[PDB]
Amino acid sequence: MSAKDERAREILRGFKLNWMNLRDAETGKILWQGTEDLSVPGVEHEARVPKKILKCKAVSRELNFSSTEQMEKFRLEQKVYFKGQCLEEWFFEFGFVIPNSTNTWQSLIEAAPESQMMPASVLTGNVIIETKFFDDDLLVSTSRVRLFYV
Amino acid sequence: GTEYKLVVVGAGGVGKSALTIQLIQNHFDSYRKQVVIDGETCLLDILDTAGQEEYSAMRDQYMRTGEGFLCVFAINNTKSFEDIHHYREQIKRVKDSEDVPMVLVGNKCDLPSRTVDTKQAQDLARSYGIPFIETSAKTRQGVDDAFYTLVREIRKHKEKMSKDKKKKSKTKC
Numbered sequence: 001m002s003a004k005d006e007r008a009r010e011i012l013r014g015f016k017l018n019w020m021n022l023r024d025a026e027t028g029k030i031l032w033q034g035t036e037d038l039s040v041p042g043v044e045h046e047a048r049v050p051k052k053i054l055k056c057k058a059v060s061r062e063l064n065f066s067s068t069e070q071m072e073k074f075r076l077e078q079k080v081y082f083k084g085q086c087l088e089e090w091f092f093e094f095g096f097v098i099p100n101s102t103n104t105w106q107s108l109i110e111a112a113p114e115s116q117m118m119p120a121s122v123l124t125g126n127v128i129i130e131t132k133f134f135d136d137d138l139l140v141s142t143s144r145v146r147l148f149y150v
Numbered sequence: 151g152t153e154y155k156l157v158v159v160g161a162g163g164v165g166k167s168a169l170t171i172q173l174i175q176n177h178f179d180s181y182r183k184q185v186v187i188d189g190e191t192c193l194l195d196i197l198d199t200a201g202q203e204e205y206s207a208m209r210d211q212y213m214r215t216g217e218g219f220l221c222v223f224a225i226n227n228t229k230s231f232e233d234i235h236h237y238r239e240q241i242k243r244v245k246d247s248e249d250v251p252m253v254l255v256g257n258k259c260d261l262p263s264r265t266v267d268t269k270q271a272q273d274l275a276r277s278y279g280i281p282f283i284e285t286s287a288k289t290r291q292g293v294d295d296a297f298y299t300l301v302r303e304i305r306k307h308k309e310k311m312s313k314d315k316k317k318k319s320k321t322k323c
C-alpha cells in the first residue's frame with residue numbers, strides 16, 4: 001500500500017504517452033494515430049478508429065512513452081469489454097525502462113478467424129478497453145477507453 | 151521410443167549406487183538402459199550422482215539436464231532424511247520451476263533399526279505433492295517401482311507441457 005502507493009505515484013508523475021499508432025502489419029500503412037492522451041486515469045477516453053482495421057489480418061500497435069522514473073518490468077494488462085462482457089484479455093510486457101528515456105513499444109495484434117469476427121456496427125461504442133499499467137507487481141494506474149469504429 | 155533422463159540424488163551412503171546397480175544389472179557414470187514400462191519401450195538414462203555431486207559445474211549440469219529426480223534417504227539415518235529438502239531446493243532453483251518430477255525414496259527398508267518413520271516420510275512427500283516409495287537395494291524391494299514411478303511422473307509432466315489455441319483479437323485493440 002502506502003510505501004508502494006507513493007512509488008506508483010512517482011512513476012505516474014513522470015510518465016507520458018506521447019503518441020499511439022495502428023499500422024497494417026503487412027503493408028506498414030498507418031491506419032490511425034492517436035491525439036488525446038489515452039493513459040490518463042479517472043476519465044473515460046474516446047477513440048475513433050477506421051472500421052477497416054477489423055479487416056486487417058494483423059495490425060501493429062506502436063506506443064511512444066517517456067518515463068522520468070526507472071522501471072524494471074513495465075507491462076500492461078488489458079481487458080476488452082463488449083457491452084460489459086469480457087471479450088478479450090491481453091498481457092503485454094515491455095521490460096526494463098531507463099530513467100528519463102523515451103521509448104517506442106510495438107505489439108503485434110492478429111485478427112480473430114473470420115467466422116468469429118464481429119461487425120463494426122455492433123462493436124462501435126460498445127467496447128471498453130481497461131488498461132492496467134504495472135511495474136512488475138506494482139499497479140501504477142488504471143485507465144479506460146471507449147472504442148468507436150468510424 | 152521415448153528416452154528419460156533420471157537422476158539419483160541424496161546424501162553419501164544412502165544407497166544411490168546400489169539402487170542404480172539393482173535397476174541396471176539386477177543384483178546387489180550415467181548409463182543407458184532399455185526398459186518396458188506400461189508396455190512402452192523406454193530408454194532410461196540413469197545418473198548416480200555419488201561421484202559428481204561435489205563439483206559445482208557437474209551438479210548444475212545434471213540438475214539442468216535431469217528430467218526426473220529420485221531423492222533418496224536411508225531409513226536408519228535421520229540426517230540423510232533432513233538433507234532431502236536441500237536437494238529438492240537446489241534442483242528447483244537450478245530448474246527455476248516448482249513442478250519438477252520427483253519421487254521420495256526411503257532406502258534400506260530391510261533394516262530393523264529404523265530412525266525415520268514411514269509416516270513422517272509420507273508427510274514430507276505429501277507436502278511436496280510427490281510419491282513416496284520404500285526400497286531395499288539389498289533385497290530389490292521397491293527398486294523397479296521407484297524408477298518406473300518416476301518415469302510415470304515425467305510422462306505426466308511432459309503431457310501437461312505439450313498441452314499448455316493462441317488467441318487473436320476481435321477488436322484490434
Ligand SMILES: Nc1nc2c(ncn2[C@@H]2O[C@H](COP(=O)(O)OP(=O)(O)O)[C@@H](O)[C@H]2O)c(=O)[nH]1
Nearest residue numbers: 162163164165166167168200257258286287288
Ligand atoms: N541393508 C542395506 N544396505 C544398503 C542398502 N543400500 C545400500 N546399502 C549399503 O549402504 C552402503 C552405501 O551404499 P551406496 O550405494 O554406496 O550409497 P551411495 O553413496 O548413496 O551410492 C553400502 O555399503 C551398501 O551396501 C539397502 O537397501 N539395505
Ligand SMILES: *C/C=C(\C)CC/C=C(\C)CCC=C(C)C
Nearest residue numbers: 017038039047131133145322323
Ligand atoms: C486499439 C486500442 C486503442 C485505440 C487504445 C489502446 C489503449 C492503450 C494502449 C492504453 C495506453 C495506456 C498506457 C500506455 C498506460
